[PDB]
Amino acid sequence: QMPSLAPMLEKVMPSVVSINVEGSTTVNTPRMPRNFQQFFGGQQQKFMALGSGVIIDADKGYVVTNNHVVDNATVIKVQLSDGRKFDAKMVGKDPRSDIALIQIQNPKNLTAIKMADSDALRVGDYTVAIGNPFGLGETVTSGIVSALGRENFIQTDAAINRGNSGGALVNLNGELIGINTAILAPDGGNIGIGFAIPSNMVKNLTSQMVEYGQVKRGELGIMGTELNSELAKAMKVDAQRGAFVSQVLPNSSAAKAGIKAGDVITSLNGKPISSFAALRAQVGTMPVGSKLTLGLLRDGKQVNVNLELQQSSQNQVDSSSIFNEMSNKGKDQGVVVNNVKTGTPAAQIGLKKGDVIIGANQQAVKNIAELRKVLDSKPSVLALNIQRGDSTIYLL
Amino acid sequence: QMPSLAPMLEKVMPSVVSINVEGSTTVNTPRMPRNFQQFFGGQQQKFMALGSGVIIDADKGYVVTNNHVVDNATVIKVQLSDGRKFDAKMVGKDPRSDIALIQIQNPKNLTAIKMADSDALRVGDYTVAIGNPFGLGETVTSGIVSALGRENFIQTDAAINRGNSGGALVNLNGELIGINTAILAPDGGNIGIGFAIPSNMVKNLTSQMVEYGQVKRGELGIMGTELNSELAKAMKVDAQRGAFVSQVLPNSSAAKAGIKAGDVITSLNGKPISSFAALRAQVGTMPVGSKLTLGLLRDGKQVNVNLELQQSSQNQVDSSSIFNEMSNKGKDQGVVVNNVKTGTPAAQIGLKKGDVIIGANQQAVKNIAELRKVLDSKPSVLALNIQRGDSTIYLL
Amino acid sequence: QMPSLAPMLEKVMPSVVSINVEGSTTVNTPRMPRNFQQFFGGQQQKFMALGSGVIIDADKGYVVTNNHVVDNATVIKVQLSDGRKFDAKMVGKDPRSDIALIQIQNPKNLTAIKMADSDALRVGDYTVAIGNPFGLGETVTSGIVSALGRENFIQTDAAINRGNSGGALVNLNGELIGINTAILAPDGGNIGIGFAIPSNMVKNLTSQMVEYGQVKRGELGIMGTELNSELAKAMKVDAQRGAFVSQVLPNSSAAKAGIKAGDVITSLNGKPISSFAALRAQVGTMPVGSKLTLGLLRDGKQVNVNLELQQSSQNQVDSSSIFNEMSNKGKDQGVVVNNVKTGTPAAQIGLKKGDVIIGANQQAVKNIAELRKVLDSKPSVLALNIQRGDSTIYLL
Amino acid sequence: AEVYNKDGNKLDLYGKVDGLHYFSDNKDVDGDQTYMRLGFKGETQVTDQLTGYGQWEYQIQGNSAENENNSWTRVAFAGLKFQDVGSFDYGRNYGVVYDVTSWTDVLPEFGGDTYGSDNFMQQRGNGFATYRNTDFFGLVDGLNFAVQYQGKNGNPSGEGFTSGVTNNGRDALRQNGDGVGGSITYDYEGFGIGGAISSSKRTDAQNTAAYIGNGDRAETYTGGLKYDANNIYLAAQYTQTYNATRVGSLGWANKAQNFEAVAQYQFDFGLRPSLAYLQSKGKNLGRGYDDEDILKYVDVGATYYFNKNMSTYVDYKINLLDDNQFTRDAGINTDNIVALGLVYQF
């Protein structure tokens, strides 16, 4: 009869799930009355998000999805394409790539998609996207590979006018080639065409979340922008062709090793650095503990140093199956906890600002994958062998 | 050589027509001067509309189209794809589905599309839309079946960025699978993807207009909305999870049988009613004279009753081939006329607010299809055997 | 395995180039301060443009592109798909069609696309567009022939949501079928679907630029609009159904021969003229020196006359390989120079407002193609045998 | 800043950048409100008695992305001044009613909003011909008066209007027919007393069923009082209007009674706290609205002056309007707003 994508879609759909997130966040307190002819310029607020995800491990119930959907989640629900409902928990997330991993709680008879090799993609190749555009459900749209970046973001015309960046990008064989994302951050929604992380990168970032707790991406800990910013002018910067250092992050390697706002990096390991962009991307091709010597500019300053795990990708209330923001520290040198909060449920448990945890409630916790591997096997007695540098206490 | 949709399009185009509507409406009288820095807050006004339609009966010259195009028409013109021009008259319309039927006056050598079976549609299936996007003519665009609702609105990516909801949705065999619509009422234009009524529903709604004068859809005659509305708050509604009754329609079954604004329906024939939506859709799966008992909420009130034909789908100046708003009454119990107007051309003929017409100017008029079947055969002498309940007069 | 457009795209891409234009223009001088709650109502300003082009002559390095990209260029750069960079110079442009021709300076090993026959296009035919949507590079998108005008602008759904009107439109065989354009002038960006000039017209307009210096399109030299304009009302025009003459252009044939603002043309060579539109398009189907008698309306006025080359398509600093706005004059009757500027680099060389150039620095210059053919072969000694009517001087 | 002063011509080029943020439950006003203003005032000595001048001021919003520009002209006028006789100027300028109401328009961010721009002769507007006499021929120190005419600003041109058009036409909420007004103020030592009256023809576009407050003319009557000495600033104004006060987007108030009061103190160390109250009470509004508050708020704020070129402020609009049908229909803000600003000026 007539050609159709329905035959492979039937072998694919069981792997695509819907995701309903419920969570809260801090919003500013509304000042009243409200005057709409007056252009001006803390409380938790519940919000609801919804997106798609792809079953990537049928046994473990591992579902890949966008970080812009599950971010700040308190409750994450998943509904299979056959209608069965499950609960899910955060296992990992990485805001850079806008990719996150979750785990269906109590999976039973699941189907996982097969991942194809991103590296074999070519522009005229056919593409099919599957997502939940406006909430009304699971929509599939078709097209082709528009641009192969060459980070290799995949570009495709199988998008959706005014809709939210769905999820799965699949080839004509039903294999996963990329997860569609949203490059319009803290928004969701597209620029006109579609951007996907390639399947090979998805596989890679995803395994890290599993086997470590987070992705090994080191940060230079500087924060800044281009040489056009109001501060590059309001501070008049000499020789403009590089990355403007607006501030050096606290307790960072850039901070520790030496550097101060103003200097404009001009190179990284000999190579020219013409824009924060160039730099932000280059430092992203280097895993923790790496050493990268870069040239700065004040009069003619330059240094060499080693970076540590970034702070963007971190964990929260999913390490201890219970409930309560740690992350990994250097190589397999335990799990270092970061900025504690105000509610202080975890600080209340004797955990400060820089407390490592090499003791797996008794054993070795070189990382959050392991640590969490124990706070899930023996939920009975828990004594966190934490040692924030000196103090080696054992709280419950 | 190379594949192409041109070969089937050539067998399809003769069935697609263009439609030019001319008509008027009531607009408010402009207050002058005009101050664009002052956000404020009867006369007929001519307007022009244009859309596409599909020839569905070559002999009778029956063309299906959107109700948002022909609504309020005074003059409706049709131009075939070969360029022949004709006049058309309203035969039916149904605002819910946004579907309307018209008849080419004096057809000669027409081609009708074959309708395929909507029920056999599947998501990866290929789709082709044909319409008049910006007026500039007849545009065809292609794609696939995105979502099969499952009312079964069909969702497809063969739409158009910023254009008006065209008309025909056809499969790769040139058969009609759906008529594209506009879910952005009293606007036309899409949300980002395309919504079509399925061909099987089109066939069904369309035959009703032919063989009855209108579609048999009973209304519960309540009007209201959700439990979020300003009135659900400004009136503080207890137990919020249902349909808010803002008002009970006059001379209605809800009115007649018993009900008053405020009560929030909680169920319909035992089943839960969590939103006006749910309800508006459920009452739409029930033809006139049906009986549906529903539970209300005031303190704990509930009733049972039978509904009558809705008022949205009605007729006007097309029943009497002449010129001048009736509709059907219950089963084949004549044709009941509704709200007369101000110009009073038909009221001037001895027709009040509730005047039935069982007399076909001499015969049986159980319905508008029949009635109109007579005011078209014998346009000589006309005596309307109308009886508005008691008075059984015979006007000309 | 699976079907793909990648195999023909690999035979096509080497012909598609990227184009970076740098140039300036006259902007108004900003008045400060700036009050954003105050709706109000000369200096050169540099700007940057970028677009795509198609190699159309491998030997001569001839690249076709949109006039909205190269217009006002001072510097035009081209980058092949393999990454080789070249410089380019204007050889021709035509704002009506929004089509321009350029020449790579110093081509080496180039590939040209094959042009297919536009006339054989049909609506269901498959289409593929190649362009640089948001600057980020060369994107290809696919689709079909939506509308075949029938000027034959091609309409296709292979466009891009919110992006700039790319360039090449190619069929499934990799042959050029149209150059995509922007009908949203002095903007770039689409209406929702794509508009392309057909390949056969591209071939035709393009050769003219080569063999003459510009396209032979005669103008009636009137300027005006429809009968709705504020001036058609503010001046109350009797019998409204034609083209409103707002002004007769200076030194024009309309001016010379006879005509004055107000008259509304009603016909052109016997045929009805119901809109400026109709007229602007009809006068565009007539090459210079043609004779077209049209009927005007004042009380009942009508005349006959012969038009000359339009002024929209002209040349500037590319005739003399050096640097400095001429155009062609009638048949091969030399090259007539038009409105000189303020910097006066060329006026400074003894060239007034109406100076012809039949002397090729010694030879025959019936046209800009020839003239420029000499100011490129012998860049040594240059004596412009110009004669602006009477004065036959010989400047350097 | 005076950037030119030579051979009897002076040019002052001035401006400010206000890095500004609003905090509000009302998301239509919430967020970045950064803006800049630029202007010039020039004067030329014609004779010892006669001076010519011109002034221009422009606001450019600093809170938009680069694909748009939101900017406007605040004032633009040229004039002549004769020593001990008076002055005349023409252009976009302030209406003479503002001579009195300006006295309470001294708040860090808010205030001055019982009226608006392009609002008959109440504030900034087009086509003002303004005559002023200072000190009564120099024979009564501190006594000033003004008489002003405003030409019609009507329907836009080129939009199919068949009456009431002007070259610079606009929407009806910002139109005006011909108007005339006057002001008198007297200031002795620290004290000030003042009054103003305006009367403008209303255009046909303004008097349609689409707008509340239909009427032949817009009239305003204003009284004001001021005290400004010993580091204390006190002022109050009361205005009665007829078919002149906008009611959001609905049109105008048949009658309105407007009141504004402010109290401010200047500490030696640079802090200037401010307290104010504003209200606008509309009467006989039509469409069943009857009597309604158009505006009602208490404003508490403070500015810190680092010097004459740098300052920072917080202003807190405590909005006493309640969310009701009327304010919803008119689109009037009923939420509180906190503004925080940091201002460089020259």
UniProtKB/Swiss-Prot annotation, chains A, B, C:
Gene3D superfamilies: 2.30.42.10, 2.40.10.120. Substrate binds at residues 22, 68, 98, 163-165, 181-185, 220-224. Keywords: Cell inner membrane, Cell membrane, Disulfide bond, Hydrolase, Membrane, Protease, Repeat, Serine protease, Signal, Stress response. Its EC number is 3.4.21.107. Belongs to the peptidase S1C family. InterPro entries: PDZ (IPR001478), PDZ_sf (IPR036034), Pept_S1C_Do (IPR011782), Peptidase_S1_PA (IPR009003), Peptidase_S1C (IPR001940). DegP is indispensable for bacterial survival at temperatures above 42 degrees Celsius, however is also able to digest its natural substrates in a reducing environment at temperatures as low as 20 degrees Celsius. The keyword Repeat applies. Changing I191N: Stimulates the proteolytic activity at low temperatures (20-30 degrees Celsius), whereas at higher temperatures (above 35 degrees Celsius), the proteolytic activity is less efficient. This is Periplasmic serine endoprotease DegP. Disruption phenotype: Decreased induction of Cpx two-component regulatory system. Increased accumulation of periplasmic accessory protein CpxP, increased accumulation and toxicity of overexpressed, misfolded periplasmic proteins. Increased resistance to hydroxyurea, probably due to decreased degradation of misfolded proteins which eventually leads to decreased OH radical formation. DegP acts as a chaperone at low temperatures but switches to a peptidase (heat shock protein) at higher temperatures. Degrades transiently denatured and unfolded or misfolded proteins which accumulate in the periplasm following heat shock or other stress conditions. DegP is efficient with Val-Xaa and Ile-Xaa peptide bonds, suggesting a preference for beta-branched side chain amino acids. Only unfolded proteins devoid of disulfide bonds appear capable of being cleaved, thereby preventing non-specific proteolysis of folded proteins. It is an enzyme of class 3 (hydrolase). Changing N190I: Loss of proteolytic activity. Inhibited by diisopropylfluorophosphate (DFP). One of its GO terms (cellular component) is plasma membrane. It comes from the Bacteria. Induction: By heat shock. Transcriptionally up-regulated by sigma-E factor and the Cpx two-component signal transduction pathway. Optimum temperature is around 55 degrees Celsius. In the range from 37 to 55 degrees Celsius, the proteolytic activity rapidly increases with temperature. Residues 209-300, 306-390 form the PDZ domain. The active site is at H68, D98, S165. Pfam families: PDZ (PF00595), Trypsin_2 (PF13365).
From Swiss-Prot, chain D:
Residues 95-112 are annotated as: Loop L3. It is a multi-pass membrane protein. SUPFAM superfamilies: Porins. Residues 22-32, 64-70, 95-120, 151-179, 199-220, 240-248, 279-297, 318-337 are extracellular. Its main location: membrane. GO terms for biological process: DNA damage response; intermembrane phospholipid transfer; monoatomic ion transmembrane transport; receptor-mediated virion attachment to host cell. The chain crosses the membrane at residues 13-21, 33-42, 53-63, 71-80, 86-94, 121-133, 143-150, 180-186, 191-198, 221-227, 232-239, 249-265, 271-278, 298-305, 310-317, 338-345. It is found in: Cell outer membrane. Disruption phenotype: Deletion of both ompC and ompF confers resistance to colicin E5 and to the toxic activity of CdiA-EC536. InterPro entries: Gram-neg_bact_OMP, Porin_dom_sf, Porin_gammaproteobac, Porin_Gram-ve, Porin_Gram-ve_CS. Mg(2+) binds at N319, L321, T334. GO terms for cellular component: cell outer membrane; pore complex. GO terms for molecular function: identical protein binding; metal ion binding; porin activity; virus receptor activity. It comes from the Bacteria. Residues 1-12, 43-52, 81-85, 134-142, 187-190, 228-231, 266-270, 306-309, 346 are periplasmic. It holds the Pfam family Porin_1. Induction: By growth in high osmolarity conditions (high sugar or salt) under control of OmpR (at protein level). In the presence of 0.2 M NaCl, 2.0 mM sodium cholate (bile salts) decreases expression from the ompC promoter; how this is mediated is unknown. Keywords: Cell outer membrane, Ion transport, Magnesium, Membrane, Metal-binding, Porin, Signal, Stress response, Transmembrane, Transmembrane beta strand, Transport. Loop L3 (residues 116-133) extends along the inner side of the beta barrel wall and may constrict the pore mid-length. Homotrimer. Forms mixed heterotrimers with OmpF and with PhoE; other mixed heterotrimers are also probable. Binds 1 Mg(2+) per subunit; could be Ca(2+) in vivo. Forms pores that allow passive diffusion of small molecules across the outer membrane. (Microbial infection) Supports colicin E5 entry in the absence of its major receptor OmpF. Belongs to the Gram-negative porin family. This is Outer membrane porin C. It comes from Escherichia coli (strain K12). The gene is ompC.
